[PDB]
Amino acid sequence: LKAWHLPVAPFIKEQQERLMITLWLSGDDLPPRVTLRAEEDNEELSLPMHRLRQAPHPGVVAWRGEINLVNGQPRRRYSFKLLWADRQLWFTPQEFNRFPPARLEQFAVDLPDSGPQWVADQVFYQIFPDRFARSQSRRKAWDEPLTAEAGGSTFYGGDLDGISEKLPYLKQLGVTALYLNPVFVAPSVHKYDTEDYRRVDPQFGGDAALLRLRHNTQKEGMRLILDGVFNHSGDSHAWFDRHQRGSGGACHNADSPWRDWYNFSPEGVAHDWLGYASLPKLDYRSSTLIDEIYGGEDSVVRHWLKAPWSMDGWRLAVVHMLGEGGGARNNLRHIAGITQAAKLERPDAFVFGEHFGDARQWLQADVEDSAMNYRGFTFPLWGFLANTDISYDPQKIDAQTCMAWMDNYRAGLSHQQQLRMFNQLDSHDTARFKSLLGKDVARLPLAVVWLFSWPGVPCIYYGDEVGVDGNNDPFCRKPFPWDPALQDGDLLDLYKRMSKLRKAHQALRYGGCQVIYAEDNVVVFVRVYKQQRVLVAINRGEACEVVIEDSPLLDVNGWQLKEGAGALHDGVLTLPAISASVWFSR
Amino acid sequence: LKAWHLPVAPFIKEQQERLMITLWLSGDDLPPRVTLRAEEDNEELSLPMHRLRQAPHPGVVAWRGEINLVNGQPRRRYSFKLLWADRQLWFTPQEFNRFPPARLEQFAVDLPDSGPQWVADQVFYQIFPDRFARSQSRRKAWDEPLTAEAGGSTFYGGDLDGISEKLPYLKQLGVTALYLNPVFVAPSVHKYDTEDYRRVDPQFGGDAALLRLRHNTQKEGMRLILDGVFNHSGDSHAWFDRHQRGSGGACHNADSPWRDWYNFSPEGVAHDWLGYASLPKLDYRSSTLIDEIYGGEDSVVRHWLKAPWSMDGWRLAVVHMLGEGGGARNNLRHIAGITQAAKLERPDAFVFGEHFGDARQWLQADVEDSAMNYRGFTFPLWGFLANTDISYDPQKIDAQTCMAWMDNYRAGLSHQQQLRMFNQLDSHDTARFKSLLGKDVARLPLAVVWLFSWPGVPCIYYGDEVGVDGNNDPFCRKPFPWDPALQDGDLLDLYKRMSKLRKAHQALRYGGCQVIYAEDNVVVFVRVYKQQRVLVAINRGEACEVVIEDSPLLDVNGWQLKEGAGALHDGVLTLPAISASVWFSR
Ligand SMILES: C[C@H]1O[C@H](O)[C@H](O)[C@@H](O)[C@H]1N[C@H]1C=C(CO)[C@@H](O)[C@H](O)[C@H]1O
Ligand SMILES: C[C@H]1O[C@H](O)[C@H](O)[C@@H](O)[C@H]1N[C@H]1C=C(CO)[C@@H](O)[C@H](O)[C@H]1O
The missing domain is CATH 2.60.40.10 (Immunoglobulins)
Known part of the structure; x- marks a missing residue:
């Protein structure tokens, strides 16, 4: 049957x-x-x-x-x-x-789909602003090695006009959309310790540089997503003001205008993010805090979505822990509230959440458009291709298990949700995937093909495309090597070709996905949209031949190979060692 | 391993x-x-x-x-x-x-458990008031056969003082808690077409008879749950008033004080329950409707929970469809709101929802305490024991599949949630389970044992315990046979013994549950609480012997057989044909 x-x-x-x-x-x-x-x-x-x-x-x-x-x-x-x-x-x-x-x-x-339909047509690119590019006319120097010392205090000087100036490179890479790490006033270099949600940090060029970047991306047809850090503030924010370098701070004033925006114990210690005292957690029980973040017309969420800023949406940092009373109480209501506010300001706003874990309860309740798909895309590949996982614990899964894993996760999502899931191989919070492959680095192109052909929207982590490596934060945020001598030009070209294949074929943007074969080293799946088919065959090990049973999904006029050195003939797949091939149907 | x-x-x-x-x-x-x-x-x-x-x-x-x-x-x-x-x-x-x-x-x-901890100590009994018992001092006669004609208009005359008078029978049966079908003013005999949420229908004895029943059950230590029908009203309610037998009806007055409590199309047809015009659906967008049902201090949900009524909770009829705009929009918020209101009036209130389908999203979001566990308990047994299902479609599942089904469902629930799931073999909305067994009626005692030993709280459907049968509504609501000649006295005694076993042993009320064996005809599981173990072995087919591998869960001083004719010795289970056995550990 x-x-x-x-x-x-x-x-x-x-x-x-x-x-x-x-x-x-x-x-x-x-x-x-x-x-x-x-x-x-x-x-x-x-x-x-x-x-x-x-x-x-x-x-x-x-x-x-x-x-x-x-x-x-x-x-x-x-x-x-x-x-x-x-x-x-x-x-x-x-x-x-x-x-x-x-x-x-x-x-x-x-049906109807009220989600952001543009997302499925995008190629995303994630930029850690301090480490991408310095503008022409502007503390470590660019070639100084990254060390484990003072990770949060070391600035290389990248800025937003640096990004604007590098828009032609990104265009040629095939990028159509940017996701920026935090850019608002904050003391650190990663800037998740927010001090002012209402101003761009002058270290990155201030408000003028972000307006230019918004203009420049609009000119080039590129979307722009900001990092929204609303589970916690920084302890230097005026609301909390730990160092009393101001007046009215919740930290040292029982009568502060924001005393109820934070949760203090009967010991005096405020609740924070996972025991980081510099990141006091916001108490969404307060009706005034709700109004300032998303409830009001000029709340933080809506502010950066209306003119002049006109951003295309929000990545929600630590979306799963936001809530009341010092923990995640009432989390789903508040994330729904943030998303609702955003779509009110901009109906086609994209709101996706940071989920290292299992995002299904959030997505099955539709409190957000999408998630950073660590659980459904990234970690299966870390396991199948790099033998590791979220905790860098050894992992030994074959193709059967990897595809059972990937297909089980997306079964919890509608077609439209699957198409806009935010897929990446690594990020500013993981070691570089290139480094994780270790001795198996020749598998890296398999993963790049997979990133552009599995359902969801792909996000390049800045520098991946030219072969930068490094272990986990701090070492995954290296300065981008603008010297072509320090660039993997062959890897760059594969990224270009994949994004071209994606723009070219509706099935890679809109298509259903059926796993056809998944045994030991070999994964084969087909994307399916109307009469169009896109066949993908991944082999993580040595050369092999695989018989593909007659499938009505594969009954086409013919197959045109577009990428890789695999060969399909009379139901036999000839796959070279450590290869990924993509066929388009004729 | x-x-x-x-x-x-x-x-x-x-x-x-x-x-x-x-x-x-x-x-x-x-x-x-x-x-x-x-x-x-x-x-x-x-x-x-x-x-x-x-x-x-x-x-x-x-x-x-x-x-x-x-x-x-x-x-x-x-x-x-x-x-x-x-x-x-x-x-x-x-x-x-x-x-x-x-x-x-x-x-x-x-931890902490803020749910109703009393529920796990209960034996429930569901009463369809018109068909249970007539009071001594009070339209068909009691012995007249139930026919398919005018099901909703045929009254046999059972009333609430009839229940009060039958409390000694229920006590001896082992019942500790009652769930009543609707009792509020309504034209039909089932009374889910509510006309007045604020008054008991005089056909069942009016408000005085329900107060006596509340007093009498309190006197006997019995809990009492009312049927709360809040997804829709009846079309005879004053709010809707379809027959203009009043003034101000939403149906025929564009200016009705409740025009916004119902949803009318651009055709004039109000949205209703599954196309039943007598059951117009309530629009929980209206802030005044929310206040009347659960929001206000004397809203309907809280009203029957405060003195003098002091009910122990609510069964929520059609809990999954309640919402705004004519459908289930915002369903989870409103069910959470109903439950929240109830626990505000009575912190230990029991609120469980009618779920013919998959209740997990409701329970995993904690909008209700529990569900009528059709999907997790009833239908697995209809399949395994009676070869049928929710649509009375043929079903052929063995023990492996039945236990994969039952264990998969509860894996979505905490221990405390599992312990208070509302388990029954049939209800006023299904054919009698006895009838569904057809030629296999000798399996009925297996199901009775299973009902009292699977995690959750058991609910007898009135008359099941003495062997009444019949097909689906209307034929599942027969008058209860008070003549012992028309009673299966042996079945009655098994029900008594099982409820006694439950009161006797903590593991059947509080215990974890591990399936030990599940192949073809035979299911074996153990309930586990501290040093106590309760072993249950069900065999739906002919006599057989089954080897039970050494299990540390079964490493006890000895086993004392309490019910059934099975024999356990040296890891071999000797199970007679069509049997269920219960051992308590020594
Ligand atoms: C706020 C956190 O969660 C967000 O969602 C970001 O995605 C993370 O990066 C994460 N860490 C940031 C903060 C700390 C903690 O001291 C630092 O350790 C990181 O370097 C820095 O980036
Ligand atoms: C309101 C409905 O949902 C509730 O939840 C009850 O559990 C059901 O019984 C159910 N049906 C009632 C109403 C109709 C429809 O016309 C009749 O068909 C039934 O006999 C009668 O009981």
Whole structure:
């Protein structure tokens, strides 16, 4: 028995306030009935399906049903209940299930989609401003080695006009969207110890440099996302003012105008971020704090989204811990509130959250558009390709396990959510992925191909594309090497080619995703959008041949190889050692 | 490799604001390190564990760690990360996992537990008031057969003083808590078409009869839960007033004081419950509607919870669809609001929701205490024992699948949530389970044993205990046969004995639950609380012998058989055909 379905054309078609749903089946004991299990306002529905007279592909029987769209919430969840005389079987994002799937692990399509539809067309690039580029006309020097000493106090001098001036490089790289680390007034170099949410830190060029950057990116058609740090302030902020270098500080004034914006124990110690005293945690019980951060018309969240700043959204730092009373009490309401405020100021605003852990409860409640997809994308690859994980603990997973992991996670997400998940191989909070591969550094191009072809929006971490390496923070924030002698020019070109493949093909931006093969060293999946197919074959080990069973998903006119040295012929994949290949259908 | 852990003593112990956590391991290639993956305010933690010098059982190595309780939210989620030099493996509620478990499918213990701790000590009994008992001093006659005609208009005359008068029968049955179907003024016999939330329907004896019932149950130490129907009103309610048999109705007055409490289309048709025009749906966008239902001090939810009514809580009818704008928009906020209001009036109030489907998103967000556990308890048994399901579609699942199903569902719930899940074999909205067994009716006692020994609180559906049967509503609401000639007296006695076993043994009220064996016809599980063990063996088919491997969970002084004709000796279970046995440890 075989089944196929993806939450996208050719399997679904919207027509006259109905969502038509098509299931493919093949095999020797097909169910004489199939029920479309759908859902309206959380009520499970049993919708009849009927066989189509015409086979869509050789040996395949298509069943078709219909979801009425006029009622019910935008997110439409569904699965397939195959019925024989004596038994039943479910078809799900995670293949066949002998007992019913979880409601939150069904196929899901958001209709209407009120999310930021532009995100799926982007290539993102994350910039740690101090370490990217100095402007022409502007404390360590650029070539001085990064050391473990005083990580938070060492400034190399990168600034925002440096980014503006490097926009032609980013354009040629294929970048269409920037995510900046914090830029607001803060004493440190990473600047997550915020001192003024209302001003750009002059060390990066002040408010004028960020306005120029906003103008310049608009001119080039590039989106711009700011780092929003709202779980905690810095202890130098006027609200907290630990060093009494001002008046009215919550820290040393029981009568401060912001005494209730922080939580102090019966010992006097304020609650902070994971025991970092420089980062006192904000108490979202306070109705005045809520108004200042997101509630009011000129709250911090909306401020940088309205003119003149007109930012395209917010990365939410430590989104999972924000809440009341010193911890994450009422976390989901407040993150929903932040997102709601942002979409009020800008309906197409992108709001994604930093989630090192499992983001599904946040995303399944729709309190944010997306997450930094560490759990669903990054760590599976650290495991499969680099033998490591979030804690740098040894990891030994084969392709079966890696794809069970990746597919299980996204089964909790609608198609539209999957398409805008924020995927990267590393960040300012992890060791460089190049370094993590260790002796297996020749696998790095596999990961770059995978980054641009797995569902979600890819984000290059500045410098990855030219081969910078280093261990975890502090050593992952090296100055970007602008000397081509210090650049991996071959790696740069692969990044260029992948972003070109992405712009070129709708399936890599909008397409469903079906894992076709996943055994030991080899992963094969296909992206699927209308008649278009994109086949990707990853081999982390030595040369091998793999038979691909006839799949109606792969029944095309022909395949044109676009990247890598793999060869597909008569259902046999010839894959060189440590390779990734991408075929486009003809 | 083997592992054991349950979210209860002997595996966990709270001491000096720390939660101590113990893992059992056995096998030939044990991990030299184990990390306790815990969570504080949603931040994943890596806590070290250390081997205990003393083996807790032969061949078992114990690791122990510690969760700091002074910070973080009440619900403490955790799992075990076994680490070797080259690889890792997770231990979870669902056995070993090669990739990390979902955050919401870990072990979880609620500390402090702010839920209704009395629920786990209860035996519930659900009464459909018209069909239970007529009072001594009071339209069909009691012995007239139930027909398909005019189901909603046929009254047999049961009333609340009938229940009061039958309290000695319920006491002897072992019942400690009642759940009543709706009793408020409504035209129908089931009375889910509410006309007045503020008055008891005189057909059941009016307000005086319910006060007597509240007094009488208090006198007998019995709890009392009312059916709260807040997703929709009846169309005869004054607010809606479809038949203009009053003034000010939302239905026929664009200026009604409650026009905004209902949602009308640009056609004039109000939104209702699943196309039943007699049940117009309430619009929880309205700030005045929110205040009347749960927001205000004398709102409907709090009204029946304060004196003189002093009810113990609310069953929430159609809890999953309640929301704004004609559908389930903002459903979770409003159900949280209802529960919050109830616990404000009565801190130990029990609020559970009607969930035919998958309740996990509601329970994982803690918007309610519990659910009618159709998905986690009822339908697995309909499948395993009666070959059917929610849609009365054929079902063929063996013990492996049934227990994978039951254990997967509860893995999404903390220990405390599992203990108060509202388990029943049938209800006023399903065919009688006795009828569903069809030719396999001899399996009915297996299900009764299972109802009283699976985690959760059992609820007898009135008449089940004496063998009434019938198909789905209308035929599942027969008049209760008070003639002992029409009663299955042997079935009645099993119910009595099971509720006695439950009162007698802490493990059946508080205990963890570990499935030990689940192959084909046979299910074996053990409830576990401190040194106490309760072993349950269910065999749905012919006589068989089953070997039980040595389990440290089963290493006790001895076993005393308490119910059924099974025999345990030297790791061999001798199980008669179609049997259920319960052993208590010695
Ligand atoms: C605020 C934190 O969470 C956010 O979400 C950022 O993503 C992180 O970078 C993170 N750390 C910042 C703060 C500290 C702590 O002292 C430093 O250790 C880091 O270098 C620095 O970046
Ligand atoms: C309101 C509904 O949901 C609640 O939650 C109850 O649990 C159900 O019983 C259910 N049905 C009631 C209403 C109708 C519909 O016309 C009748 O069909 C039923 O007989 C009657 O009981």
